[PDB]
């Protein structure tokens, strides 16, 4: 249960800019410039 919207709110919280679920998992990414 990763929860494509439990996921990517508590991730784009933390401070970083996407993310998605991956083989039932919960992963993001970060962005800079």
């Known amino acids: 249960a990763c929860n494509d919207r439990d996921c990517s709110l508590d ?3 933390k401070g970083y800019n996407f993310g998605k679920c991956v083989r039932g998992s919960c992963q ?3 962005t800079s410039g």
Do not use: L, P
Request: proline share 0%.
């Open 11 to 13: 991730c784009i919280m």
């Open 28 to 30: 993001c990414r970060r």
